[PDB]
Amino acid sequence: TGYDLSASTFSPDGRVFQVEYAMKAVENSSTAIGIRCKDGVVFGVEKLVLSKLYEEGSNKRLFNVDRHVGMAVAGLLADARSLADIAREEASNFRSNFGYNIPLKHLADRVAMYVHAYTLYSAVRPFGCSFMLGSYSVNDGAQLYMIDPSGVSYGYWGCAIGKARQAAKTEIEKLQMKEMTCRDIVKEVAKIIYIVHDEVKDKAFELELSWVGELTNGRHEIVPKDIREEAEKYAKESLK
Amino acid sequence: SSAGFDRHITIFSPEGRLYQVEYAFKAINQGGLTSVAVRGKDCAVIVTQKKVPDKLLDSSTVTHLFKITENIGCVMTGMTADSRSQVQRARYEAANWKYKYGYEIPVDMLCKRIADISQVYTQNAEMRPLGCCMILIGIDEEQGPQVYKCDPAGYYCGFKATAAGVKQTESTSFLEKKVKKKFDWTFEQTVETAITCLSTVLSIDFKPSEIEVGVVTVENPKFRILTEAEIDAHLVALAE
Amino acid sequence: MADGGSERADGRIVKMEVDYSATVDQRLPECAKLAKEGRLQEVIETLLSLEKQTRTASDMVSTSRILVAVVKMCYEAKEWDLLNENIMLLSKRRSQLKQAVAKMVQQCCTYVEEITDLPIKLRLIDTLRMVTEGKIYVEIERARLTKTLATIKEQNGDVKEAASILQELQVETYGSMEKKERV
Amino acid sequence: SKMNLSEEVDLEDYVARPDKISGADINSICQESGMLAVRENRYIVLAKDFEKAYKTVIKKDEQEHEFYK
Amino acid sequence: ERGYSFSLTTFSPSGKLVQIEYALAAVAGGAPSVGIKAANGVVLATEKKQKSILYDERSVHKVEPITKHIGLVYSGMGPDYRVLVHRARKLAQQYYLVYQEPIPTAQLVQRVASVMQEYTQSGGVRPFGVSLLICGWNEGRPYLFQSDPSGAYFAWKATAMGKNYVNGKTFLEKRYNEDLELEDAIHTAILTLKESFEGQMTEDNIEVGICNEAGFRRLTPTEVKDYLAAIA
C-alpha cells in the first residue's frame, strides 16, 4: 500500500486512487438527471425525505448561477455550493470585464480548470462533487454540460448522475429530444425518475424540477406548481 | 532497484532511474487512443480516431484537435483534464510571445517552452507530472512544414513521421518502412499513407465519422479541420 | 456474378478485333474488381479464363501483327502487376493460372514456330520471369523444355547453351511426379 | 547455405543490426521465412519473407525512454 | 502554492550523500563524450544516436554555445541540461552588463557550480543528473573544465564522461600528450569515440564544436563527414 494517499503520487500502474475514491463517493448521492429539449433545457432532481422534521424547500440540490445559467449538483453539498460560489463569481468577472453574458463553453472551461487545480497537490484534496450545467441562448441555442470530479466536461443531448446512473440513462435514450418542445419533457423527465428509487430503498422522495429556455424568456427559474402537479398527475400511470 | 521513496516521489533510484515519470508514460496509454502525424514535402497532416459511445453525447464536443494560433494547431493524447490545461498554457505562451516580440512564434520555440514548463514538475518533488503527451505542427519560412512532439518528461524532437498512443510502436514500425523507400510525397500521398497507417495497424477500414483530420499546407498556411464530406472524398479516393 | 463477365465477354468479343486493346485495358480494372472478390469458388476462375483469354486474343492481334516486341513487356509486366493489383499472386492462384499462363505459352508455343530471333528471346525473358513461382510450380512442365532446347537450337548446338540446361534439371523432379518424360 | 535465397538477397544488412540475437533464433529466422515462402506457394525464397520473418521473430520495442541520455 | 522547505538529502551513518551518489550513477548511464585541449583551442565531441530513422538530427543539438567564445556539452539526461544552460546564458549577460567584457570561463564555472551546490542543498528538490564540459580560449590560452552533480569542478587536460569513461581515460592516457594541434585532437577524439561507438559512425552520429583564438564555433556535417572521412 501507500500508493493511494496523496493527489501527487501515481499508482504503480500509473493512476490516482484518490480521484477514483472521490468519484466513488458520487454514487452515494441520490440522482441528478437533466436533458435538453428542442428549445430549452430541463433539469430533474429527486430528493429523499430523511425525516418528517425537515421543512419542505430545505437544502436544495438545485442551484442558480446566473440569470440564465442553471446548476444541478450531486456530491458533498458544501463543496457543491462552494463551486457554485466561485462559478457565480466567475460569471461576475466575465460580465464585469467584458459587458455581456458568459457562454457555457467558456464557463465550464474555467470551472473545469479550477476543479483540475485541486488534482495535483498533497496540500489539498479533490472535490467529491459532480454536477451538470445547461442554459439557453437566443444566439447559440441550448447547451448541456456535465463535470466529473476529475475536471473533464462534455456536451450532451442528455446526462444522468447519482445512484442509478445506467438504470436512469437506459430509458433516456428511448425519448426523442431532437424534436420535443419541453412541455412533454416535463412529464417524461418526471416519469423516468418516477420509475426509479423504489419504496424498498426510499421511504418517500420529493420531486424537484428546473426549467430554462426561451419559453422561460431565457431566464432560469424553477417549474411552476401546476405543471409539476400535472407531472404527479402523470406519475401513477406507470403502474400498468 | 528501489530505496526510500523513489517509488513515491521524483527522486533517484539506486539504479539511477526515477519511477514516477515512466509510470506516467503509460498513463497516456490508459487513455485508449492512438494518433498519427505525417510531414509532407509542402504540407503536414494530423489524423486520429475518436470514439463516441452514446447518442446522448454530442459528437461535436470530442475534438482532440486544438487551434493554438492562426497558423498553429495541435493534437492531444493522454488524459483530457491535463491535456486541456496544457492547451491553455500553450495559448497563453503564444500570445505572450506575440505581445513581447510582434511576430509569430516558431513551433520549435513554443515546444521548447512547453518542455521547459513540463521540466519543472519532474524537477520538483511536489507536483504530479501531467500524464498527457503533446504533438504540434507548423509552417515555417525557409523550413516549410515541421512536426514536433513533446513528452511529459520534457524531451522533444523534430520528426518526419509521428505516431503516439497505444499502437505507437507498431505504427512507427509501419512508418519507417513507409519512409525508408524515400519517395517524394505530395498532399494526397501523405493523406493516404496517414490514413492507411492506423487503418492497417488498427485494421479498421472505417467510415468517415470516427476520425478527425487536421492539416496545413504551404499554400494556405491557416490551420484547418476537414469536413466529413472531403474526408469521404479522400476515403473513397483511397478505396480504389 | 459469372454471367456479368459472360455478358461483357459476349458484348466485347466483337470489340476485340474491331476495337483496340486500350478498352481491354479498360476492362482489366472492372474484371480486376471482380478479381478482388471472387465471392464464389469457380466464378473468378471462369472469369480469368476469359480475360486472360482475351489477353491471348490481344496476342492474336498484336503478336500476329508487327506490334510484338514492345507490347509483350507491356503484357507480362502488367500480368505480374495483376499479380499484385488486388490480391497477391494473381488474386487466388488456385485453378486459374493453369488456364492462363500455360495458355500464354500455348499461344507463344504457336508463335515460337512463327517469329524470328529478334523478339522471341524477349518472349523468353518474358517467360523466364515465371520460374520462381509462376510457370513451373503447380502444373506446367514440358513447355520450358522445348524453349531451353530452342536456345540451343538458335545457334544449333554450341557448348554454352548446352551447358545452360543445368539450372533446371534436378529440381523439378520434385515439381511433377512423373516417371517417364522427366527421365 | 541450404536454402534457395533467390539471387540478390543481402545478409549483411541483417548482420549489421545490433541487439540480443541468439544462436538458436537464426534457425527460426530462416525456418519461419521458409515457411512463409511455402505459405506463398513459392519454392524459391525472396527478400520480403526475410524482412517479415525477422521482425516477426525479434519483438522488442526500445526499452529506452530516450531522455535518460 | 509553496514547497516543502526541507532538504531531502541527509548524511548517511557512513557519511555519504546518497542522492548525489545515485545521481552520479545516472550520469554514468548517460551518453559518452570526451573533450581535449591542445595548444590553440579545445575540441569537444559527443556521441548522438537517434533511436530511429524518423527523427530530425538537425532539430536538437548537444554542442551549445554560451557566448562568442564558450561552448558546452554534457553527458547525462536531457531536460535537466537545458535549464542550467539557460541559466548560464543569463549569467554571462549579468557579467557583461556590469563589466562590459566577455566573461572568464573560470568565473562562469564559479557561478554555475554555485547554482548546482545551492540547488542540491535547497529544500525539497532532487539534484541535477548531468555533468558538463566547458571550453574557451580566454586571454590566449584555452581552458577545459568539468563539473559534477555535487557542484565541484576540475581543470582537466583531457578527459571523457558518459559510458566506458574508465576505458576512455586510459585510451587518452596512452594517446594524448602536451604538444598537439586542433585537428589532431579532432582525429584522436574521433578515435576515442570510436573506442565505444556503434557499428556505423556517420556524419550525424556525433556533434563536434571547437574553440580557437577566433572563438567558439560548431561544425557542419560536411566537414564533420570529412573528419569522419580519412579517419580510423
From Swiss-Prot, chain A:
Record-listed N6-acetyllysine modification sites: 52, 201, 225
Entry-annotated residues carrying Phosphoserine: 238
Any one of the GO BP annotations: proteasome-mediated ubiquitin-dependent protein catabolic process
Alphabetized Pfam families for the sequence: Proteasome (PF00227), Proteasome_A_N (PF10584)
Induction section of the entry: Down-regulated by antioxidants BO-653 and probucol. Up-regulated by bacterial lipopolysaccharides (LPS) and TNF.
Gene Ontology MF terms: ubiquitin protein ligase binding
Chief localisation class: cytoplasm
Protein name: Proteasome subunit alpha type-3
Annotated localization: Cytoplasm; Nucleus
Disulfide bond positions: none
Native source organism of the sequence: Homo sapiens (Human)
Cellular compartments per GO CC: cytoplasm; cytosol; extracellular exosome; nucleoplasm; nucleus; proteasome complex; proteasome core complex; proteasome core complex, alpha-subunit complex
Gene: PSMA3
Similarity annotation: Belongs to the peptidase T1A family.
Swiss-Prot record, chain B:
GO cellular component: cilium; cytoplasm; cytosol; extracellular exosome; mitochondrion; myofibril; nuclear matrix; nucleoplasm
Positions of glycan attachment: 1
PTM annotation (N6-acetyllysine): residues: 98, 100
GO-annotated molecular function: endopeptidase activity; NF-kappaB binding; purine ribonucleoside triphosphate binding; RNA binding
S-S pairs: none
Modified residues (Phosphoserine): 13, 59-60
Family: Belongs to the peptidase T1A family.
Coiled coil regions in record: none
Keyword set, alphabetical order: Acetylation, Cytoplasm, Glycoprotein, Nucleus, Phosphoprotein, Proteasome
General function of this protein: Component of the 20S core proteasome complex involved in the proteolytic degradation of most intracellular proteins. This complex plays numerous essential roles within the cell by associating with different regulatory particles. Associated with two 19S regulatory particles, forms the 26S proteasome and thus participates in the ATP-dependent degradation of ubiquitinated proteins.
GO terms (BP aspect): positive regulation of canonical NF-kappaB signal transduction; proteasome-mediated ubiquitin-dependent protein catabolic process; proteolysis involved in protein catabolic process; regulation of inflammatory response
Main location class: cytoplasm
The name this protein goes by in its record: Proteasome subunit alpha type-6
The species this protein was found in: Homo sapiens
The keyword DNA-binding is assigned to this record: no
Swiss-Prot record, chain C:
Cross-link entry Glycyl lysine isopeptide (Lys-Gly) (interchain with G-Cter in SUMO2), positions: 92
Gene Ontology biological-process annotations: proteasome-mediated ubiquitin-dependent protein catabolic process
Entry GO CC: cytoplasm; cytosol; extracellular exosome; extracellular region; ficolin-1-rich granule lumen; membrane; nucleoplasm; proteasome accessory complex
UniProt crosslink position (Glycyl lysine isopeptide (Lys-Gly) (interchain with G-Cter in SUMO1)): 92
The UniProt record lists the keyword Nucleotidyltransferase: no
Similarity field: Belongs to the proteasome subunit p55 family.
Pathological condition linked to this protein in its record: Stankiewicz-Isidor syndrome: A neurodevelopmental disorder characterized by delayed psychomotor development, intellectual disability, behavioral disorders, mild dysmorphism, ophthalmologic anomalies, feeding difficulties, deafness, and variable congenital malformations of the cardiac and/or urogenital systems.
Protein name (database record): 26S proteasome non-ATPase regulatory subunit 12
Full-sequence range covered: 1 to 183 of 456
UniProtKB/Swiss-Prot annotation, chain D:
Compartments reported by the entry: Cytoplasm; Nucleus
Family per similarity comment: Belongs to the AAA ATPase family.
Residue list for modification N6-acetyllysine: 48, 52
Stated name of the protein: 26S proteasome regulatory subunit 6B
Portion of the parent chain present: 350 to 418 of 418
Top-level taxon of the source organism: Eukaryota
Role summary: Component of the 26S proteasome, a multiprotein complex involved in the ATP-dependent degradation of ubiquitinated proteins. This complex plays a key role in the maintenance of protein homeostasis by removing misfolded or damaged proteins, which could impair cellular functions, and by removing proteins whose functions are no longer required. Therefore, the proteasome participates in numerous cellular processes, including cell cycle progression, apoptosis, or DNA damage repair.
Quaternary state and interactors: Component of the 19S proteasome regulatory particle complex. The 26S proteasome consists of a 20S core particle (CP) and two 19S regulatory subunits (RP). The regulatory particle is made of a lid composed of 9 subunits, a base containing 6 ATPases including PSMC4 and few additional components. Interacts with NR1I3. Interacts with PAAF1. Interacts with TRIM5. Interacts with ZFAND1.
Species this chain originates from: Homo sapiens (Human)
